[PDB]
Amino acid sequence: DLSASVPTRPAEPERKTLADYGGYPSALDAVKQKNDAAVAAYLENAGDSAMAENVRNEWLKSLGARRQWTLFAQEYAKLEPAGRAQEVECYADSSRNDYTRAAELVKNTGKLPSGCTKLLEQAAASGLLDGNDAWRRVRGLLAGRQTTDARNLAAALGSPFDGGTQGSREYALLNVIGKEARKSPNAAALLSEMESGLSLEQRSFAWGVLGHYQSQNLNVPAALDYYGKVADRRQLTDDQIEWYARAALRARRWDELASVISHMPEKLQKSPTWLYWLARSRAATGNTQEAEKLYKQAAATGRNFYAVLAGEELGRKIDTRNNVPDAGKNSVRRMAEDGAVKRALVLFQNSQSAGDAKMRRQAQAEWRFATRGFDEDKLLTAAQTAFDHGFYDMAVNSAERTDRKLNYTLRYISPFKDTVIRHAQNVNVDPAWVYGLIRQESRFVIGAQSRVGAQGLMQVMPATAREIAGKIGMDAAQLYTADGNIRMGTWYMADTKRRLQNNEVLATAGYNAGPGRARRWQADTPLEGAVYAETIPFSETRDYVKKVMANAAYYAALFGAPHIPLKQRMGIVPAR
Template structure:
């Protein structure tokens, strides 16, 4: 995405689709037609008329608005009573109604409506209200929530407040500290009051007595502005005599995260090393590792990952990096075991990096036979899929991006519980209709039956290849970027105006047009968009000397990408892992892995992700 920190990404729903793929070559399963066809299963939901679907759409947003603005239960009842079957619009309306009911404590109605939701469609706040209503008994939910340091929905805060007296009090205080450090002052005050120790009215000094007074003083070094101070370690030490070990340890961890995200990795490591590890949240643990990784301090990388909670240790990211650390430390056998685990984690950046570390290579050999015409016909007659397609066709006919967004929501709803054969049949239907982003979404959800021709579709190949080669960039890289940007969605538009397959901002497009002497034919023109986008991508690459840094620059701006370099040449994978913006870090990994897959599909020579990501030059 060209500078999506300056702008919001392509229709929010499309961004959620992003998932790049990696397939270990050896375990590809062979699936015969006889094994494939009998497992295609779709629902018996009735196919509704287009007039019924569009009538529902016309009432959908006004119903949500009425629920949010005035809590109009009757609006929800009327809308839901008009539905002939469950669908994405009804699910969202019911979720919003449930939030209203939960906030008012109307538990009998809440429980009756909650029972009608598909388990895969319940949002987090309603999961919390279901605990309060007695509809659910999931003690692990509260145990997980209390470990969160950031903002939670109102219903989840209510659940924690009502449960607080029975929870581990150290964890309760840790959440209060986290809320204060994240400027969630009201939620922090409410939680402290729930355990009978209200915070002082004025925070930042040693007001009052007991734990609450100490937490007030702690805030003087954990608030957002204080944490940015390069002298924050000394400031924490100066007041530590008035704090408990746990309080001071929390402050060091919070400050460590702030400095790591500001690329002050040396300061961050010093702070993290003094932190109370029991209070580090998941993001802080990850920035702790990244800080050591930035200096290739492999012993520290290994030790930090080994101390992480098991949930984090088992992520392919940290399996890979711990394997790298063990390898650097001469412990090859243990490293190989972790590379093996990471390589089998699915189709993602680190699975492919681990596979290559084991001597393997990307595979794009599909093992699923393309869906037959009969299977595609069955998919198209599934009522939930048909509803999504009706909305999609209406969005195209009227050039209406809001309807397209609802069509995407309905598609995700329709394929949520499909088995893999059915997913591939649905993907084929979407591809045939031109609903490219959702064809990829469905194909991406399979783990065993793989159709790389849909998962990594390559429309407009002649145009893209021609312009990519004219400006001297790898067509596979251009495709990897387009897949991440727009999922080949013609007319894609961000909320701030970036347009087309390669998501160019109008100002950037005009600048490129001026430089290459091209007349504008509009950014929705496929050929013009690709011509400008590939030129701009090549220009960013030429000025940076690195595909990896250029990819980061396309998303967050070339200036930021340059700032994230080290003072010495840096392994591209380490550069990518230590990018401070979550969106850009994820974006770079996905684009580069996508490019590796496209290279394999196109028979291009650069089929190694490790080599492609390369080295980022020093500042």
């Protein structure tokens, strides 16, 4: 049975929370204005809230950048360790001259926040960076168009870009690894021609750049030829080696795939993706007991695309039966009275009544703050609390964070059923697919709005709303109402599917990236759905398709629809 234990942190009146949020935006602008007196005032008797934690984190990034180390250290002490932003941790550790985190951070080859970038340059300037990892990051920044970060890290390592030693060799290599130079019809020939006087590390990385470019363009033969020249695969960035694996996957080179995965950082090897595809490689070469071991490890990763596929390879069907009772209504009422939970619900309720989308976003921040480090039982009670208050996305937020206690009704909530079901049927698309899409797009937040402007439950772009509305005789502004949004989103699902050879995997990619891009990613042979999905060049769409289809399989099992394994829902994507 679920524990009835609920936290009882001190609560504040609804008026005080509203008054503190009244000044949250000004506190944030005060940080940007470097008005330290203003920020300290806002904070000095804030609640123990996400408002205070958010303002304090942003303040500390500004104090760290401004080297106000006395004030920094006083305020860093008021952050809860779980609530420290990464860049704040970086500034703190640089102030302590502690570069233990730098050994892990330096493994990241892309853009880092300023405090984290400086932490690495400081470690570099003291001798306390792994030199192999450090120069790998330099190259990764060079390939990544982060020339200035690359330059500063080369300089911090004692070999600047203008000093005639290693750093000038690496900078010179931009004629191969540059963003536009890697596209050259001659990139490989130049690399081959200057190959003999390059180090083993510089050569492996450079061949990885050329293979990575080819692999993301879906020129699989060209990519595998270039990746096959990489002598030390540890020198590849995480993106490079994953697109090696993706090239080997798309060409069904199972032995090469398994070898590539074994050269991945152990963290990548343990991801559901490479657990599952390693298992598939093993099973396809007949190493059946090694595959069964890996499928079990993938399946244990939880409620995700590859865990389900791995389960299906083990003969395990998705089972959406809860293994835990519903939360008792009394614990749900008590939970709403915990001071941190109550603060989140106050902001949420009042965002509805006041029509304040920013206030609703802070309600989410308070919710994640209030529930951070709840045990599985409190997480499930909180989930029902959120659901009983209409806070649909935070019910999913809390319910999906458990590992052993599974409430599928709360992980895969289905509000608005009689509406979503009818609009799906009206365009003859699977309502389990539509719910899967909504869950990923908006988490059932009717006023959701992405950075690029995608709107509402189904995250329809305003541009797209204008095409849809003219075709079906709507008003394009119906985009901003729940019913109009669902009608437009469901119609666009159906329409994109029709333009993409009626394939549901293509249509999901095309919903997010546009049908023209989804069509460009098809091969000249048919592809198994999950192979098409895992080799989508846009990381946003690649992650999106897998999550939508995984949600769709859970919803279909929940609704009691005729059983469709996820592997068959992925089907076969047709050749062009």
